[PDB]
Design a protein around this ligand. Structure first.
Ligand SMILES: CCCCCCCCCCCCCCCCCC(=O)OC[C@H](CO[C@@H]1O[C@H](CO[C@H]2O[C@H](CO)[C@H](O)[C@H](O)[C@H]2O)[C@H](O)[C@H](O)[C@H]1O)OC(=O)CCCCCCCCCCCCCCCCC
Ligand code: CLA
Ligand code: CLA
Ligand code: CLA
Ligand code: CLA
Ligand code: CLA
Ligand SMILES: CCCCCCCCCCCCCCCC(=O)OC[C@H](CO[C@@H]1O[C@H](CS(=O)(=O)O)[C@@H](O)[C@H](O)[C@H]1O)OC(=O)CCCCCCCCCCCCCCC
Ligand code: HEC
Ligand SMILES: CC1=C(/C=C/C(C)=C/C=C/C(C)=C/C=C/C=C(C)/C=C/C=C(C)/C=C/C2=C(C)CCCC2(C)C)C(C)(C)CCC1
Ligand SMILES: CC1=C(/C=C/C(C)=C/C=C/C(C)=C/C=C/C=C(C)/C=C/C=C(C)/C=C/C2=C(C)CCCC2(C)C)C(C)(C)CCC1
Ligand SMILES: CC1=C(/C=C/C(C)=C/C=C/C(C)=C/C=C/C=C(C)/C=C/C=C(C)/C=C/C2=C(C)CCCC2(C)C)C(C)(C)CCC1
Ligand SMILES: CCCCCCCCCCCCCCCCCC(=O)O
Ligand code: OEX
Ligand SMILES: [Cl-]
Ligand SMILES: [Cl-]
Lengths: 341, 334, 36, 442, 34, 82, 137
C-alpha cells in the first residue's frame, strides 16, 4: 500500500469522466491534437508550404480551412518546435507546417491511449475486449494513410492535409495518380463500409419491427426494462421473415453480432493494405492486356480506357498548382483536352 | 375452395419457402427478365454507341473485357429519353448497337426492386409484424432510382445514367464530380456520414454485444453455441455493456434501452442515405455543390487559392477530357 | 417485331390484372389477427 | 399513448382540436404566399429578367396575365402587391379560426353538431366531406377558365410577336385531345401531360376537370362506397392520411418534371430557359456565329463524321448536333420559325434568322439552369462572378425532395394503418406469436 | 452537498473556455475587409 | 447511476452559476475578439495580412524550398515587402 | 500588394492621356460589370464568341481602338465589330439598344466610366487569368 497503489486507486475511481493509467497518455494527446487542429484552422495559413489560404482569419470557411502538410522540402522531418528547422521560433514553426506533424503525432499517440482505455475499462468492468479489438481498424487506417503513406513518398507534403476540402483533394489525387478505385484492396474496403452500413440499418430495422408487445403504449420504447432477462424482439419471427424474403436469415444472435464486428473491421484493414502499396506507387493502375490491344487497335474502347483519359486530365490540369515546389509549367498546347472543352 | 380463391391462397401463403404475394407476382417476372438479359449482355453483347457519336464502347467479356472492366453500356445519346423496346428496332442488330438491353434491364429491375420493397411490407403484414422494414430499404431503392432514372431524366438522356459495370460505375462518379462538384455538396457529405457512421455503429454494436456475452461454453467450442435459436433469455448482458461503454465515454452517451439503440442503428444510415439519394436526384437538376472558386482574394485583387481551387483544377481535368469527341461547343450544358 | 410487341402487351396486362384483382380480393383480411 | 414527438397523433379522435390544427396550418400557407410575394416585390427590379432575381411567386402571377405585357415586360406591379396583401390579410382570419378551434373551441365536434362532427369509420360521412371538397376544387379549376376566357386571359409565350396576354375564346373540348394527353407515354418526344403546349388545351382540360370534380363531388355526397371498395381499403384516419400522402407524392414528382420541361405554362421569359432549351440555344448561337463568318453549316462534317451543326435524329428529323442531339424534342417560340416539315429547314437557317432570335439564343444559352448551391451561375468549374440559379432548378429540386419524403410518409402511415387496423402495431403478442403456430419452412 | 471543483469541472472548462475565446475571434473576423 | 458530482441541470439553472458566467463568457468572447481586432493573431501565428501575400509587382508564391534555411527563406520573403 | 493609384491609372484616350480611378470607382465598375456584362464576359472572355476577349492587347487591335476609357465608353453606346465595319447594337447591349437590352436603361455616364475602368484595371491585377479562360482558373 505504497505510492503506486495509492495513485492506482485514484486514477481508477468511478467519476463522471473515467481517467485510468491510460488517461495520462490519452487526455493530453487527444486534447493537443484537437487543439492544434482548431488553432491552425482558425489562425494559421498555408502560404509558405502550399501557396494557399487555409484559416478563418484568412477568409476560409469550414469546408476549405485545413492544417496543411509541411512543404515538400521538409522531407519526413519530425518538425519539432525545438528542432533545426524552426529553432524554437513558434511563428516560423507554424508557417513551416509544424502543426501538421504536431497533430499527426499527438493524434497517433492519442489513438494508442484511446485503445488502451478500451483495454483498461474492459478489464475493470469484467467484459471481453472486443471493442478494443474492433478499434484496430481505425488505427490501421490512420497509420497507413497519415504516416506510412507519405513515408514511402518524398515527404509529408503528399500526406492528407487535415481539412474537409483538402481531403476531397486527397481523394481526387488518388484517382488521377494512383487509379485507386481500380484497386481490389480499396474495393473490399468499400464492401466493408457499405456492408456495415447495410448491416447497421437492416439489423436495427429488424429488431424494431419484430418487437414483442410488452406495453400498451404506442411508443414502444417505454416497454423495455434494461434488467429484463427476456429478449425484447422475436428472433424466430425475424428469422422466418428474412428466410422467406431473402432466402437465408440469421438464426444465431451471437454470430449475427460477431458478423457486424467482422465486416467493417475487415473492410478497413483491407484498404489499409492497399494504401501501404500506394506508399510505394505499387498501384493497381493498368491491365496490361487492355493496353496492348488498345495500342494496336484504335477502335477498342472500354470504360477502363475512358477512365485513364480522365486520370490524365486530372494529372496535367492539377499538378502545377497542387505541387508548386516542382515548378511545373505546362503551356496551353501541352494540356490534354477533348474537343471544344 | 373456388379456383380463384385457391390461387389467392397460394399467392399469399405463409408456408411457401420463398414468399410470393401480390407484389411478387410482378417482381418474379421483371427480375427474371432483367437478370437474364444482364447475364447474356455482360457475356456477349457487342459494342454500344453510348454517346451517340458512332464510337462504340465494348462492355462484354467476349469482346475483350474482364470482370472489372465489363459493363452493360447505357443506351445511345441519340435516343435521349425515348423509349427503345426491342419492337422499336429494325433488327436486334440495331437494338444491340444503340444500347437497348440497358433500357430493358433497368426498367425491369426498377419495377422489380420497387415490388421488392412492397413484398417486404406484405409479408410483414401476413406474419403479424410491424411494417417499416420496407422503409429502411427505401433508402437503397431511392438511390438506385437516382442514378438509373432521375439523373437521366434531368440531364435528358439514359446515356448519362450509371453503367452496369464496375469500371463504368467509376466513370460515372468521376464525370459526376466534374459536372456537379458532388464532394462539396452537403447531401453527399451526409451520405458519407450515414455510411461511415453506419459502419462505425455496426462495429460498435457488434463489439459491445460480443463483449458482453454470458459464459455458456468452454474454451474448446465456439461461443456461438451458447445461443440456441428461439431461447427466451437474452444471450448478452446489456447492463455490463452499458457499464463499459458509458465509462468509455460518459454515462449518458450510452444507451441502456435496447429499443432506442436499435432504432438509432436503423435511423442513422437510412437517413444519411436518403439525403445522398436526394443529392444525386437534385444534382439531376443542376443544383450543384458549393463553389468557392476564387472566393479568397488579397488587397490588390490577386486570387489567393484555397483547397477548393485545387479541387477545381482536378475537376477541370475531368471536364476537358470526358467524352472527348462528343462536344462541339464550349459549354457542356448537359 | 409486332408479334413480339403483341406478346409483351398481353403478358404484361395479364400480370397487372393479377396484381389489381389480387389486392381487391379482400387483402386486409389476409392477416393473422383480426380479419375484416 | 403517444410521446411528445408523436404528439399530433393525439388529435386523431379530437375532431375540434384537429380542425384548429388544419385551419391554423392553412393560415401559415396563406401567410407565406402573402409574405413571400411582398418580399419578392420589395426586391423586384423590372429592368432585370425575373429569373435573374430569385422569383418564384411573381412568375406564377405574371403567367395568369397580371402585370405583364408584350414579351413579358412588366408593365404594372400593383397586381403583385394586391395578391400578396390579400393573401397576407387572409392568413390572420385563418390564424384566428385556427387557434380558436385548437385552444378554446369545443375539443370534439360530434356532440356540438351532427353535421360538422365525424367519425373516421363513417364511410358515408367521409365520402360526403370528400364530395364537398371535390366541388370546391372543381370551382377552383373553373376560376382558371374564367380568368382565361372572361377576365383578361393568360400569358401566351407562343403568341405571335414575342408573347403577350391573350384571351382564350376556343378552349379545346375534344376529349380525344384532352384525354389523349393522359394516354401519351411519359418518355421522350411524348412527355405525357407535360407536353401540353398551347393555352387552348390548358383551358379545356380545366373545364373538363372542373365538371368532373363537381360530378364526382356530387356523386360522393349521394353514395356510400360499394362492397368491393369496402373490402379493399382500411377505414381509419391514418389510412386516409396515407392515401393523400401517396397522391401528393405522385403530384410532386409530376410538378418537378413540369417545371423542368414545360415552357408553355412555365414561360421561359419568366422562369428562365429549360435545360433542353439552353442546350439547343448554344448550338443555335454558334451556328449563327459561324455562318456569319462563311461556314456552310449544313455541309460541315464534325470530328465524329456527324454534322458539326446539324444532323439527323433517329427518325430522320434535321436537328442540332453535338451533345444536344439528346434535346431535339425541344420546342420553343424562338426556334419553331425555323422548322420545316423535315425538321430544321436549311434555307430558313441561311436566310431568315432574325436579330431577336440571335439575342434570345444568346440569352438562354448564358442562363442555362446550372448553378452552385451558393448561387454561382454556370458549370461547376466556373469562377465566382455571376450570382444566379434558375428558378427551374430551385423548383425542380425542392419539389423532388418533398415528393420523395411524402412517398416515405405514405409507406410509414400506410404500413402503420394496416398494422393498427389488424391489432399488431405495438408488437407481437408473446402468448399468440403467429409464426410459432405455423409449420416450419423446412 | 457537492464539490465545486472536480476532475469533471476541469475537463469542462478545458474545452469550454477556449471555445468562447475562439468564437469571439471568429466573430471579429467577419468584419475584416481586404 | 451517479458518481457524486453536482448535476449539470442543477448547475445551469442556478443563480450563482449565471452570476459568475454572465461575466466570464462575454469577457472571453471579448478577449478572442480583441486578439483579432488588434492584429495580434496575425503576428503570433505569422499569417499574411490581406496586403502582404505578394509584393506589389509580384505573383510568385514565396515557397519554402530548403529544409534548414527555411526559417531564413521566410524572413527573406517578409523583408521583400517592407 | 494593394490597389495603388498606379494600378488604378489607365489610358483615357488614344492621344496618351490618362486618368486615375478611385478605388470606389473600381469597385463600382466591378459591380456594374457583374450586373450588366458578366453573364457573357465572366473572367474577361466572351462565352458567346470566345474568339474575342477583353484583354487589353485584343482591345488595342480593335478598330476604333478600345484599350482606353473613351473607346470603351463609346463601345457601350454604339458597339461595332472588331474591324469597325458594322454596328451591332441589335445583338449587343448598349445604350443605343437599351430598348431591347433593358439592363442598360438605368446606366449613367459615370457608370460607363466605371465599367470601362474596371475592364482596363483588371488585367493589371490578374494578368493572364483575365480573358485566359478555364486554363488559368
Ligand atoms: C398508381 C402507381 C403508378 C404506377 C404506374 C407507373 C407506370 C409509368 C412509370 C413511370 C416512368 C416515368 C418515366 C419518365 C421519363 C421521362 O421522360 O420523364 C419526364 C416526363 C416529361 O417528358 C419530357 O417531356 C417533354 C415535353 O416537352 C415538350 O413540350 C413542352 C411544352 O411547353 C416544351 O415545348 C418542350 O420543349 C418540349 O420538348 C418532352 O416531350 C421530352 O422529350 C420528355 O422527356 O415526365 C412525365 O411524363 C411526368 C411524370 C414523371 C414522373 C416520373 C418521376 C418518377 C419518380 C421516381 C420516384 C422515385 C422513386 C422513389 C423510391 C422510393
Ligand atoms: C403547424 C404546426 C402545428 C400545429 C398547428 C399543431 C397544433 C396542435 N398541437 Mg401539435 N406539434 C407540432 C406542430 C403543430 N401542432 C410539432 C412540431 C410538435 C413537436 C414539438 C408538436 C407536438 C405536440 C404535442 C406534444 C401535443 C400537440 C398538441 C396540439 C394541439 C393542442 C395544443 C395545445 O393545447 O397547446 C396549448 C398551447 C398553448 C396554450 C401555447 C400558445 C399557443 C398559441 C396557439 C400560439 C399562437 C401564436 C400566434 C402568433 C397567435 C396569433 C393570433 C391571431 C391570429 C389572433 C393543437 C391542435 C397537443 C394535443 O394533441 O392535445 C391533445 C399535444 O399534446 N402537439
Ligand atoms: C419550397 C419552396 C421554395 C423554393 C423553391 C424557394 C426558392 C428560393 N427562395 Mg424561397 N423560401 C421558402 C420556400 C422556397 N424558396 C420558404 C418556406 C421561406 C421562408 C423561410 C423562404 C424564404 C425566402 C427568402 C427570405 C429568400 C428566398 C430566396 C429564394 C431563392 C434562393 C434560395 C437559396 O439560396 O437557398 C439557399 C439554400 C438553402 C438554405 C438550403 C436549405 C436546405 C434545407 C434546410 C434541407 C431541407 C430538407 C427537408 C425539406 C430561391 C429562388 C432568396 C431570394 O433570392 O429572394 C428573392 C431570399 O432571400 N426565400
Ligand atoms: C374549414 C374550416 C372550418 C370549419 C369546418 C369550421 C367549423 C365550425 N366552426 Mg369555425 N372558423 C373557421 C373555419 C372553420 N370552422 C374560421 C376561418 C374562423 C375564423 C374566421 C372560425 C371561427 C369560429 C368561431 C368563432 C366559432 C366557430 C364555430 C364553428 C362550428 C359552427 C359553425 C356554424 O354554426 O356556422 C355556420 C356557418 C356560417 C355562419 C358560415 C357563413 C358563410 C361563410 C362565412 C362564407 C364561406 C367562406 C368561403 C367558402 C371561403 C372564404 C373566402 C376567401 C377565399 C376570400 C363548426 C364546427 C363555433 C363553435 O365552435 O361553437 C362554439 C364558434 O363559436 N368557428
Ligand atoms: C387534376 C388535374 C390537373 C392538372 C393536370 C392541372 C395542370 C395544370 N394546372 Mg390546374 N388546377 C386543377 C387541376 C389540375 N391542373 C384544379 C383542381 C385546380 C383548382 C384547385 C386548378 C387550378 C389551377 C390554377 C389556378 C392554375 C393551374 C395551373 C396548371 C398548370 C401548371 C401547374 C402545374 O404544373 O401543375 C401540374 C399538375 C399536377 C401536379 C396535378 C396532377 C394530378 C394527377 C395527374 C392526378 C392525381 C389523381 C389523384 C391522386 C386522385 C386519385 C383519385 C383516386 C380515387 C383514383 C398545369 C397545366 C396554372 C396554369 O394553368 O397557368 C396557366 C395556374 O395558374 N391550375
Ligand atoms: C380526390 C379524389 C377522389 C377520391 C379520393 C375518391 C375516392 C373514391 N371514389 Mg371517387 N370519384 C372522383 C374523385 C375521387 N374519388 C371523381 C372526381 C369522380 C367522377 C368521375 C369519381 C367517381 C367515382 C365512382 C364512379 C366511383 C368512385 C368510388 C370511389 C371509392 C373507391 C375508389 C377506388 O377504388 O379507387 C381505386 C381505383 C381503382 C381500383 C381503379 C382505377 C383505375 C385507373 C383509371 C387506373 C390508372 C392508373 C395509372 C397508374 C394512373 C395514371 C393516369 C392514367 C389514367 C393514364 C373511393 C371512396 C367508387 C365507389 O365506391 O363509389 C361509391 C365508384 O364506384 N368514385
Ligand atoms: C507546462 C506543462 C503543462 C502541463 C502540465 C499539467 C499538469 C497536470 C495537471 C492535471 C491534474 C488536474 C486534476 C484536478 C483535480 C482536482 O480538482 O482535485 C482537487 C479538488 C477535487 O475535489 C474533489 O473532487 C473529488 C471528485 S474527482 O476526483 O474530481 O472525481 C471528490 O472526491 C472530493 O471529495 C472533492 O473535494
Ligand atoms: C456589359 C455592358 C458589357 C460590356 C461592357 C461589354 N459586353 Fe460584350 N460581347 C459579346 C459578343 C458576342 C461580342 C463580340 C461582338 C462581335 O464583335 O461580333 C462582345 C464584344 C464585346 C467587346 C469587344 C471585345 C474586343 O476584343 O474588341 C466589349 C468591349 C464588350 N463586349 C463589352 C457578348 C456580350 C453579351 C452576351 C449577351 C453581353 C451581355 C455582353 N457582351 C455585355 C457586355
Ligand atoms: C496548438 C498548440 C497548443 C495547444 C493549443 C490548444 C490546446 C488549443 C485549444 C483550442 C480550442 C479548444 C479551441 C476551441 C474552439 C472551438 C470552436 C471554434 C467551436 C466552434 C463551434 C461552433 C461553430 C458550433 C456551432 C454549432 C453549429 C454550427 C451547428 C450545431 C450547433 C452548434 C452550436 C454546435 C499549445 C498551447 C500546447 C502550444 C503549441 C501549439
Ligand atoms: C395551434 C398551435 C400552434 C400553431 C399555431 C398557428 C400555426 C398559428 C397561425 C396563426 C397565423 C397564421 C397568424 C396570422 C397572422 C397574420 C397577421 C396578424 C397579419 C397581419 C397583417 C398586417 C398587419 C398587414 C399590414 C400590411 C399591409 C396591410 C400592407 C403591406 C404592409 C403591411 C404588411 C404592414 C403551435 C404549433 C405554435 C402550438 C400548438 C397550437
Ligand atoms: C386539367 C388539364 C388537363 C387535363 C387533365 C385531366 C383530364 C386529368 C385526368 C386525370 C385522371 C383522370 C387521373 C386518374 C388517376 C387515377 C389514379 C391515380 C388511380 C389510382 C389507383 C390506385 C391507387 C389503386 C390502388 C389499388 C389497387 C390497384 C388494388 C386494390 C387496392 C388499391 C385500391 C389500393 C390537360 C392534361 C389536358 C392539360 C392541362 C390541364
Ligand atoms: C512524454 C513527452 C512529453 C514531451 C512534451 C514536450 C514538452 C513541451 C515542449 C515545449 C518546447 C518549447 C521549447 C522551444 C524553445 C527551444 C529553443 C531552441 O531551439 O533551442
Ligand atoms: O454524356 Mn455523359 O456527359 Ca453529362 O455533360 Mn454533357 O453530357 Mn456527356 O457531356 Mn459532360
Ligand atoms: Cl468519359
Ligand atoms: Cl456540344
Amino acid at each position: 500500500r505504497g505510492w503506486f497503489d495509492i495513485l492506482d486507486d485514484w486514477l481508477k475511481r468511478d467519476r463522471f469522466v473515467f481517467v485510468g493509467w491510460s488517461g495520462i497518455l490519452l487526455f493530453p494527446c487527444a486534447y493537443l491534437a484537437l487543439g492544434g487542429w482548431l488553432t491552425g484552422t482558425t489562425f494559421v495559413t498555408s502560404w509558405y508550404t502550399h501557396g494557399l489560404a487555409s484559416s478563418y482569419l484568412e477568409g476560409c470557411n469550414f469546408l476549405t480551412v485545413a492544417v496543411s502538410t509541411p512543404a515538400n522540402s521538409m522531407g519526413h522531418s519530425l518538425l519539432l518546435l525545438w528542432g533545426p528547422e524552426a529553432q524554437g521560433d513558434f511563428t516560423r514553426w507554424c508557417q513551416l507546417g509544424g502543426l501538421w506533424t504536431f497533430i499527426a503525432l499527438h493524434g497517433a499517440f492519442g489513438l494508442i491511449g484511446f485503445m488502451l482505455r478500451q483495454f483498461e475499462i474492459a478489464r475493470l468492468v469484467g467484459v471481453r475486449p472486443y471493442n478494443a479489438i474492433a478499434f484496430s481498424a481505425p488505427i490501421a487506417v490512420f497509420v497507413s494513410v497519415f504516416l506510412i503513406y507519405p513515408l514511402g513518398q518524398s515527404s509529408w507534403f503528399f500526406a492528407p492535409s487535415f481539412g474537409v476540402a483538402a481531403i476531397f483533394r486527397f481523394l481526387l489525387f488518388f484517382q488521377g495518380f494512383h487509379n485507386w478505385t481500380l484497386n481490389p484492396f480499396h474495393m473490399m474496403g468499400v464492401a466493408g463500409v457499405l456492408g456495415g452500413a447495410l448491416l447497421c440499418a437492416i439489423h436495427g430495422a429488424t429488431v424494431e419491427n419484430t418487437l414483442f408487445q410488452d406495453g400498451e403504449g404506442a411508443s414502444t420504447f417505454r416497454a423495455f426494462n434494461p434488467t429484463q432477462a427476456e429478449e425484447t424482439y422475436s428472433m424466430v419471427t425475424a428469422n422466418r421473415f428474412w428466410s422467406q424474403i431473402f432466402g437465408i436469415a440469421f438464426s444465431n444472435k451471437r454470430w449475427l453480432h460477431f458478423f457486424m464486428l467482422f465486416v467493417p473491421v475487415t473492410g478497413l484493414w483491407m484498404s489499409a493494405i492497399g494504401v501501404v502499396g500506394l506508399a510505394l506507387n505499387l498501384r493497381s493502375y493498368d491491365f496490361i492486356s487492355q493496353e496492348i490491344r488498345a495500342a494496336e487497335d484504335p477502335e477498342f474502347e472500354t470504360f477502363y480506357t475512358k477512365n485513364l483519359l480522365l486520370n490524365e486530365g486530372i494529372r496535367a490540369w492539377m499538378a502545377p498548382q497542387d505541387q508548386p515546389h516542382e515548378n511545373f509549367v505546362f503551356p496551353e498546347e501541352v494540356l490534354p483536352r477533348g474537343n471544344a472543352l | 375452395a373456388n379456383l380463384w380463391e385457391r390461387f389467392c391462397n397460394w399467392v399469399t401463403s405463409t408456408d411457401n419457402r420463398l414468399y410470393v404475394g401480390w407484389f411478387g407476382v410482378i417482381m418474379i417476372p421483371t427480375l427474371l427478365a432483367a437478370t437474364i438479359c444482364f447475364v447474356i449482355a455482360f457475356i456477349a453483347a457487342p459494342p454500344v454507341d453510348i454517346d451517340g457519336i458512332r464510337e462504340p464502347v465494348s462492355g462484354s467479356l467476349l469482346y475483350g473485357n474482364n470482370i472489372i472492366t465489363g459493363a452493360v453500356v447505357p443506351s445511345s445519346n441519340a435516343i435521349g429519353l425515348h423509349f427503345y423496346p426491342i419492337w422499336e428496332a429494325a433488327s436486334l442488330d440495331e437494338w444491340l448497337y444503340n444500347g437497348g438491353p440497358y433500357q430493358l434491364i433497368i426498367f425491369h429491375f426498377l419495377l422489380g426492386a420497387s415490388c421488392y420493397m412492397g413484398r417486404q411490407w406484405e409479408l410483414s403484414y401476413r406474419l403479424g409484424m410491424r411494417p417499416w422494414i420496407c422503409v429502411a430499404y427505401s433508402a437503397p431503392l431511392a438511390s438506385a432510382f437516382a442514378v438509373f432514372l432521375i439523373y437521366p431524366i434531368g440531364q435528358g438522356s439514359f446515356s448519362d445514367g450509371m453503367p452496369l459495370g464496375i469500371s463504368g460505375t467509376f466513370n460515372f462518379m468521376i464525370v459526376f464530380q466534374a459536372e456537379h462538384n458532388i464532394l462539396m455538396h452537403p447531401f453527399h457529405q451526409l451520405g458519407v456520414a450515414g455510411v461511415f457512421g453506419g459502419a462505425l455503429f455496426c462495429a460498435m454494436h457488434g463489439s459491445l454485444v460480443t463483449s458482453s456475452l454470458i459464459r455458456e461454453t468452454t474454451e474448446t467450442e465456439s461461443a456461438n453455441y451458447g445461443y440456441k435459436f428461439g431461447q427466451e433469455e437474452e444471450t448478452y448482458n446489456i447492463v455490463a455493456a452499458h457499464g463499459y461503454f458509458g465509462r468509455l465515454i460518459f454515462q449518458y452517451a450510452s444507451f441502456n434501452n435496447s429499443r432506442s439503440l436499435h432504432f438509432f442503428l436503423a435511423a442513422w444510415p437510412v437517413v444519411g442515405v436518403w439525403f445522398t439519394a436526394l443529392g444525386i436526384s437534385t444534382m439531376a437538376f443542376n443544383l450543384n455543390g458549393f463553389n468557392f472558386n476564387h472566393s479568397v482574394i488579397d488587397a490588390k485583387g490577386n486570387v489567393i487559392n484555397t483547397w477548393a481551387d485545387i479541387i477545381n483544377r482536378a475537376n477541370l481535368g475531368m471536364e476537358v477530357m470526358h467524352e472527348r469527341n462528343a462536344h462541339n461547343f464550349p459549354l457542356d450544358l448537359a | 417485331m409486332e408479334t413480339l410487341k403483341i406478346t409483351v402487351y398481353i403478358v404484361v396486362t395479364f400480370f397487372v390484372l393479377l396484381f389489381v384483382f389480387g389486392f381487391l380480393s379482400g387483402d386486409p383480411a389476409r392477416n393473422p389477427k383480426r380479419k375484416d | 399513448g403517444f410521446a411528445w414527438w408523436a404528439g399530433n397523433a393525439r388529435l386523431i379522435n379530437l375532431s375540434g382540436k384537429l380542425l384548429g390544427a388544419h385551419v391554423a396550418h392553412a393560415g401559415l400557407i396563406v401567410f407565406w404566399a402573402g409574405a413571400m410575394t411582398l418580399f419578392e416585390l420589395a426586391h423586384f427590379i423590372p429592368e432585370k429578367p425575373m429569373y435573374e432575381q430569385g422569383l418564384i411567386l411573381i412568375p406564377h402571377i405574371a403567367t395568369l396575365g397580371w402585370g405583364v405585357g408584350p414579351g413579358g415586360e412588366v408593365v404594372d406591379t400593383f397586381p403583385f402587391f394586391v395578391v400578396g396583401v390579400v393573401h397576407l390579410i387572409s392568413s390572420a382570419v385563418l390564424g384566428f379560426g385556427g387557434v380558436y378551434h385548437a385552444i378554446r373551441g369545443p375539443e370534439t365536434l360530434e356532440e356540438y353538431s351532427s353535421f360538422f362532427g365525424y367519425d373516421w369509420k363513417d364511410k358515408n360521412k367521409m365520402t360526403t366531406i370528400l364530395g364537398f371538397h371535390l366541388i370546391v376544387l372543381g370551382i377552383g379549376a373553373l376560376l382558371l377558365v374564367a380568368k382565361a376566357m372572361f377576365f383578361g386571359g393568360l400569358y401566351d409565350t407562343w403568341a405571335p410577336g414575342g408573347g403577350d396576354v391573350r384571351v382564350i375564346t376556343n378552349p379545346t373540348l375534344d376529349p380525344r385531345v384532352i384525354f389523349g394527353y393522359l394516354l401519351k407515354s411519359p418518355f421522350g418526344g411524348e412527355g405525357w401531360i407535360v407536353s401540353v403546349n398551347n393555352l387552348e388545351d390548358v383551358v379545356g382540360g380545366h373545364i373538363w376537370i372542373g365538371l368532373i370534380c363537381i360530378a364526382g363531388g356530387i356523386w360522393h355526397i349521394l353514395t356510400t362506397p360499394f362492397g368491393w371498395a369496402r373490402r379493399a381499403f382500411i377505414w381509419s384516419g391514418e389510412a386516409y392520411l396515407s392515401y393523400s400522402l401517396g397522391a401528393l407524392s405522385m403530384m410532386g414528382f409530376i410538378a418537378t418534371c413540369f417545371v423542368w420541361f414545360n415552357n408553355t405554362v412555365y414561360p421561359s421569359e419568366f422562369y428562365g430557359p429549360t435545360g433542353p432549351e439552353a442546350s439547343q440555344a448554344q448550338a443555335m448561337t454558334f451556328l449563327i456565329r459561324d455562318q456569319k463568318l462563311g461556314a456552310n453549316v449544313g455541309s460541315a462534317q464534325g470530328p465524329t463524321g456527324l454534322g458539326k451543326y446539324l444532323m439527323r435524329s433517329p427518325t430522320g428529323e434535321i436537328i442540332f448536333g453535338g451533345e444536344t442531339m439528346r434535346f431535339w424534342d425541344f420546342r420553343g417560340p424562338w426556334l419553331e420559325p425555323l422548322r420545316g416539315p423535315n425538321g430544321l429547314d436549311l434555307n430558313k437557317i441561311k436566310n431568315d434568322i432574325q436579330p431577336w432570335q440571335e439575342r434570345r439564343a444568346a440569352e438562354y444559352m448564358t442562363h442555362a439552369p446550372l448553378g452552385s448551391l451558393n448561387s454561382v451561375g454556370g458549370v461547376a468549374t466556373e469562377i465566382n462572378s455571376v450570382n444566379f440559379v434558375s428558378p427551374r432548378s430551385w423548383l425542380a429540386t425542392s419539389h423532388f425532395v418533398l415528393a420523395f419524403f411524402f412517398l416515405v410518409g405514405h409507406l410509414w402511415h400506410a404500413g402503420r394503418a394496416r398494422a393498427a387496423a389488424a391489432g399488431f402495431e405495438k408488437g407481437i403478442d408473446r402468448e399468440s406469436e403467429p409464426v410459432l403456430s405455423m409449420p416450419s419452412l423446412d | 452537498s457537492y464539490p465545486i471543483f472536480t476532475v469533471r469541472w476541469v475537463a469542462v472548462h478545458t474545452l469550454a473556455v477556449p471555445t468562447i475565446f475562439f468564437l469571439g475571434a471568429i466573430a471579429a473576423m467577419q468584419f475584416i475587409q481586404r | 447511476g451517479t458518481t457524486g458530482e453536482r448535476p449539470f441541470s442543477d448547475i445551469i439553472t442556478s443563480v450563482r452559476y449565471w452570476v459568475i458566467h454572465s461575466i466570464t463568457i462575454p469577457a472571453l468572447f471579448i478577449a478572442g475578439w480583441l486578439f483579432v481586432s488588434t492584429g495580434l493573431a496575425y503576428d503570433v501565428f505569422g499569417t499574411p495580412r490581406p496586403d502582404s501575400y505578394y509584393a506589389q509587382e509580384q505573383r510568385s508564391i514565396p515557397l519554402v524550398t530548403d529544409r534548414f534555411e527555411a526559417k531564413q527563406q521566410v524572413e527573406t520573403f517578409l523583408e521583400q515587402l517592407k | 500588394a494593394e490597389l495603388t493609384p498606379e494600378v488604378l491609372t489607365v489610358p483615357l484616350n488614344s492621344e496618351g492621356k490618362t486618368i486615375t480611378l478611385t478605388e470606389k470607382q473600381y469597385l463600382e465598375g466591378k459591380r456594374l460589370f457583374q450586373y450588366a456584362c458578366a453573364s457573357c464576359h465572366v473572367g474577361g472572355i466572351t462565352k458567346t464568341n470566345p474568339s474575342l476577349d477583353l484583354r487589353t492587347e485584343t482591345l488595342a487591335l480593335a478598330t476604333p481602338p478600345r484599350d482606353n476609357i473613351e473607346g470603351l465608353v463609346d463601345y457601350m453606346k454604339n458597339p461595332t465589330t472588331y474591324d469597325g465595319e458594322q454596328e451591332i447594337a441589335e445583338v449587343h447591349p448598349s445604350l443605343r439598344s437599351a430598348d431591347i437590352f433593358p439592363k442598360m436603361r438605368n446606366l449613367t455616364e459615370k457608370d460607363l466610366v466605371a465599367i470601362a475602368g474596371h475592364i482596363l484595371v483588371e488585367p493589371k491585377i490578374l494578368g493572364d487569368k483575365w480573358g485566359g479562360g478555364k486554363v488559368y482558373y
